[PDB]
Ligand binder design. Structure first.
Ligand SMILES: Nc1nc2c(ncn2[C@@H]2O[C@H](COP(=O)(O)OP(=O)(O)O)[C@@H](O)[C@H]2O)c(=O)[nH]1
Ligand SMILES: [Mg+2]
Length: 207
């Protein structure tokens, strides 16, 4: 409402995927979320409060980043519980990480039925891409939205969050009116390559 003292609009977002796919690098692009992060000892999670500013006011995604436990097993129920949305990440330079996406999805939806989920293929700044648009099909039968991302270049950073916000708020016309302050790109995502990858996804989607 148009008054001070209102409860903030916030959502628990779980960020899952194989170790080394770039989950932590991704969440850390949002500078204030990194400054304000909190480590929860009982679960071994760092929660990053990521505010985005929409045409309908601020929305916060409390992004749960693992403390690396996915490197030696699955995540505990306490990690997933009460999640309102999720991002499943893989690395487009490592086919195995895409092959493991169905396992992550299974584990997630066992605890969180029917939440909105974005699938992200990270590291698209790397020239030698292994998992290409043609091969990325898992999202279709599971109703996930897919985006290519590059955490190191901020490429497509806001896209998963905008899609999730629209689904969560029930507003297909929601827009982000200003970008959050992001760590500046460490590598430049080549614009021609970005355009080609976007076209490749479009062609794949129409089959
Ligand atoms: N080139 C490139 N490297 C990345 C990107 N994202 C992460 N990395 C690297 O991938 C490695 C694993 O990243 P990390 O964030 O720790 O992955 P996590 O285990 O999924 O949390 C690190 O060496 C990162 O520097 C990216 O978008 N592009
Ligand atoms: Mg990590």
């Amino acid at each position: 409402s148009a008054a001070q003292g209102e409860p903030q609009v916030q959502f628990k977002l779980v960020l899952v995927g194989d170790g080394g796919t770039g989950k932590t690098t991704f969440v850390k692009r949002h500078l204030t979320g990194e400054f304000e992060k909190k480590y929860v000892a009982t679960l071994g999670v760092e929660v990053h409060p990521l505010v985005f500013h929409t045409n309908r006011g601020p929305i916060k995604f409390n992004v749960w980043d693992t403390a690396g436990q996915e490197k030696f097993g699955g995540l505990r129920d306490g990690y997933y519980i009460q999640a309102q949305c999720a991002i499943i990440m893989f690395d487009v330079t490592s086919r195995v990480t895409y092959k493991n996406v169905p396992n992550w999805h299974r584990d997630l939806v066992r605890v969180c039925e029917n939440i909105p989920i974005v699938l992200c293929g990270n590291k698209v700044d790397i020239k030698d891409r292994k998992v290409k648009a043609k091969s990325i099909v898992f999202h279709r039968k599971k109703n996930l939205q897919y985006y290519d991302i590059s955490a190191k270049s901020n490429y497509n950073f806001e896209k998963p969050f905008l899609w999730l916000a629209r689904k969560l708020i029930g507003d297909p016309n929601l827009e982000f009116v200003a970008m959050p302050a992001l760590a500046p790109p460490e590598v430049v995502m080549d614009p021609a390559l970005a355009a080609q990858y976007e076209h490749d996804l479009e062609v794949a989607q129409t089959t």
